[PDB]
Design a protein around this ligand. Structure first.
Ligand SMILES: [Zn+2]
Lengths: 9, 235
């Protein structure tokens, strides 16, 4: 769960 | 008695001398995150990316870099709570381990580890990675990469983390910016499953308003103060 590491924007 | 889950981010290690991506300009050590923390970036210029992690890995082990009082407080918190405590960190440093914490979940990996690009086997590794450094786990030796989760990759330990998010009675996020997902969404999951949520930070995070209780200031003062308050409260 949670999806991949990603930055907001 | 309460189950306590702590999530730490880069802020906790700032007083120790470790910097991170400051989303104001989206630069980490004056590099664009695209170039030093994505699979594409590593595909495009592996020499630069390996050099970048080599520099970070060397800097982490310099004598001036030490756990600070916030790290020590979290080790005291684990000592007090034992199996009812879990520490998850976004950080790739080893300052929690140096402070005395054990069983730390490094959801974004560890700067002092590398990974076989073929088998996925993980090695402790304190020195530079050069192109001559290949794995010892494969018949056909494969290049090693930092065991660091890049943007676009799946974080580590997520099943255990989500389990702890549900199980927690108290969720404390320390030194997080609120801009890096999925970690920045953990507070929502914790709240969903009934935890009391606490933010300890130098600067309020993007998601700070979702937290029930919050204290701001230098980590080395705020985190020990909160750990003392919590342990007194627990008796
Ligand atoms: Zn291998």
């Amino acid at each position: 769960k949670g999806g991949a590491k990603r930055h907001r924007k | 008695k309460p189950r306590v889950l702590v999530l730490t981010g880069a802020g906790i290690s700032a007083e120790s001398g470790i910097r991170t991506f400051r989303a104001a300009d989206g630069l980490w050590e004056e590099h664009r995150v695209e170039d030093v923390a994505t699979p594409e970036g590593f595909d495009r210029d592996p020499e630069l990316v390996q050099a970048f992690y080599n520099a970070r890995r060397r800097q982490l082990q310099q004598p001036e870099i030490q756990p600070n009082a916030a790290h020590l407080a979290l080790a005291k918190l684990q000592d007090a709570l034992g199996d009812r405590f879990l520490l998850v960190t976004q950080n790739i440093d080893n300052l929690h381990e140096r402070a005395g914490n054990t069983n730390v979940i490094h959801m974004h990996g560890e700067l002092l580890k590398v990974r076989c690009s073929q088998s996925g086997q993980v090695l402790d590794w304190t020195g530079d990675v050069t192109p001559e450094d290949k794995c010892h786990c494969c018949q056909f030796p494969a290049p090693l990469r930092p065991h660091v989760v890049w943007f676009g990759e799946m974080p580590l330990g997520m099943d255990e983390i989500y389990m702890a998010l549900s199980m927690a009675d108290i969720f404390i996020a320390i030194g997080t910016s609120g801009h890096v997902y999925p970690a920045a969404g953990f507070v929502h999951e914790a709240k969903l499953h009934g935890a009391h949520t606490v933010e300890l930070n130098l600067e309020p995070s993007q998601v700070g308003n979702e937290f029930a209780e919050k204290y701001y200031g230098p980590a080395s003062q705020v985190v020990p103060e909160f750990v003392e308050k919590l342990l007194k409260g627990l008796k």
